[PDB]
């Protein structure tokens, strides 16, 4: 019962669990986790990120 319950709960939850520090966001210094980056992270070296106004 304990082993089956552990396996079944792990099966339920593992769908939810996502590694927050999986390197997914591409960056000039290699793929990085989301929280380490934003739209201001240079996707490539010398990238020109304009401070564009939101009309």
Ligand X SMILES: CCCCCCCCCCCCCCCC(=O)O[C@H](COC(=O)CCCCCCC[C@@H](C)CCCCCCCCC)COP(=O)(O)O[C@H]1[C@H](O)[C@H](O)[C@H](O)[C@@H](O)[C@@H]1O
6 binds ligand X, rule: CB under 6 A:
yes
Nearer to another protein among residue 22 and residue 43 (C-beta)? 43
Nearer to ligand X among residue 12 and residue 50 (C-beta)? 12
Q: What is the 3-state secondary structure (H, E, C) of 12-50?
A: HHHCCCCCCCCCCECCCCCCECHHHCCCCCCCCCCCCCC
Residue 34, binding choice from ligand X, another protein, ligand MQ9, none, Cβ under 5 to 8 Å by partner class: none
Residues lying near another protein in the complex (CB under 8 A) are found at 26, 28, 43-48
- Tokens 């927050």, residue located: 20
């Amino acid at each position: 019962l304990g082993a089956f319950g552990a396996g079944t709960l792990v099966a339920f939850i593992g769908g939810l669990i996502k590694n927050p520090w999986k390197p997914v966001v591409p960056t000039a210094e290699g793929k990085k986790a989301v929280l380490w980056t934003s739209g201001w992270t240079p996707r490539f070296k010398g990238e020109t990120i304009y401070l564009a106004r939101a009309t």
